[PDB]
Design an enzyme around this catalytic site. Structure first.
Site, PDB file in Angstrom:
ATOM      1  N   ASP A  38       0.946  -1.052   0.048  1.00 42.58           N
ATOM      2  CA  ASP A  38       0.043  -0.032  -0.008  1.00 42.58           C
ATOM      3  C   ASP A  38       0.912   1.150  -0.011  1.00 42.58           C
ATOM      4  OD1 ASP A  38      -2.687   1.441   0.466  1.00 42.58           O
ATOM      5  OD2 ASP A  38      -1.310   2.090   2.083  1.00 42.58           O
ATOM      6  N   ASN A  50      -2.386 -10.883  -4.266  1.00 44.35           N
ATOM      7  CA  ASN A  50      -2.172 -12.325  -4.455  1.00 44.35           C
ATOM      8  C   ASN A  50      -0.792 -12.615  -3.756  1.00 44.35           C
ATOM      9  OD1 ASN A  50      -4.470 -13.099  -5.900  1.00 44.35           O
ATOM     10  ND2 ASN A  50      -3.465 -12.095  -7.790  1.00 44.35           N
ATOM     11  N   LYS A  71       1.825 -15.429  -3.126  1.00 48.25           N
ATOM     12  CA  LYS A  71       2.009 -16.619  -3.914  1.00 48.25           C
ATOM     13  C   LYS A  71       3.007 -17.565  -2.983  1.00 48.25           C
ATOM     14  CE  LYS A  71       1.348 -16.206  -8.356  1.00 48.25           C
ATOM     15  NZ  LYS A  71      -0.074 -15.630  -8.512  1.00 48.25           N
ATOM     16  N   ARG A 129     -10.293  10.756 -11.746  1.00 42.13           N
ATOM     17  CA  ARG A 129      -9.931  10.814 -10.553  1.00 42.13           C
ATOM     18  C   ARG A 129      -9.400   9.449 -10.089  1.00 42.13           C
ATOM     19  NH1 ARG A 129     -13.551  13.878  -6.259  1.00 42.13           N
ATOM     20  NH2 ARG A 129     -14.268  11.580  -6.171  1.00 42.13           N
ATOM     21  N   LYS A 130      -9.387   8.338 -10.880  1.00 43.36           N
ATOM     22  CA  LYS A 130      -8.881   6.918 -10.711  1.00 43.36           C
ATOM     23  C   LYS A 130      -7.617   6.753 -11.120  1.00 43.36           C
ATOM     24  CE  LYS A 130     -13.417   4.825 -10.601  1.00 43.36           C
ATOM     25  NZ  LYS A 130     -14.270   3.502 -10.822  1.00 43.36           N
TER      26      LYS A 130
END
Lengths: 166, 167
Positions: free
Chosen positions: B94, B116, B118, B139-140
């Site tokens: 993050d 994910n 692994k 805005r994405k």
């Protein structure tokens, strides 16, 4: 031998209230409080001094396959100014859904965690992380959860997760 | 007067030091830049003493819209016995994807994080998190990444994310 999942002075009024409520739910045996005990290795969620980091307690309902974590996020969990870091939230989600999967399947490894952050959580807030085992397919354990305010009106986050039986 | 924490200290393992040196060299032509990291409320990823928690440094390449994080997870980040807590891995993911979006487009908030796992990451190991701004729609901000061993022969994790630019 210290159990961190019982009240200490850092616990906010809201956390204490919900704790008492869930302890009442344990009286008929349908719910159970999980103790959380604490070469340098330390469980991440119990590596802060009281109040500073993660303050929490988990209650488990085996029949419902449901794990509820009451969680109060301390000042050292900051990300965006005034809010709990996305990573800290993910950490408590992982801890809750992971414990839920473990209660159902034993030792499992986390395979996927998919979190929708709907509303940011204020620093020092108390939230309820309600997780539930949704299905088991062979060695696959699918668990979802929500993260909500104490009054349940505010949905902060939702997540799905997959665990694989080792 | 704030101490920059995104530099070597005695807790840094030799493989992290070597990779740090490689990225400092990539900064020579200005394409890459090392991000200072500094430390009531405290930034989550800088809330441990040296070596015990998150040890990391980020390098940003603006023309590529790419952020690389070098990360050594200390003993207080344990989840499964001997391994880095999935939450700690998610935190550094993050941090990396969020900083990538922020360096490219400004103040954002995390909206989705899809990780994910692994292979589990041994405690006190060093990994490289390579993230890329893939696309922007209004805005994405869509950012993906992977988490690999220093030698890139082991793939630990992959993720996608969505950040929303604050108005």
């Amino acid at each position: 031998l210290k159990d961190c999942s019982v009240p200490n002075p850092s616990w906010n009024k809201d956390l204490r209230l919900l704790f008492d409520q869930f302890m009442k739910k344990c009286e008929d045996g349908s719910w159970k409080r999980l103790p959380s005990y604490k070469s340098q290795a330390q469980l991440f969620t119990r590596s802060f001094d009281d109040g500073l980091g993660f303050e929490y307690v988990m209650f488990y309902n085996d029949i419902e396959k449901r794990m509820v974590c009451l969680f109060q996020g301390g000042p050292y969990l900051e990300g965006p100014p005034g809010f709990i870091h996305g990573g800290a939230i993910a950490t408590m989600i992982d801890a809750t859904v992971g414990m839920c999967a473990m209660m159902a399947g034993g030792i499992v490894m986390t395979a996927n965690l998919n979190i929708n952050y709907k509303r940011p959580i204020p620093l020092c807030s108390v939230v309820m992380i309600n997780s539930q085992l949704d299905k088991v397919e062979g060695r696959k354990f699918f668990v979802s959860c929500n993260v909500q305010s104490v009054d349940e009106k505010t949905l902060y986050s939702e997540a799905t997760s997959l665990f694989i039986k080792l």
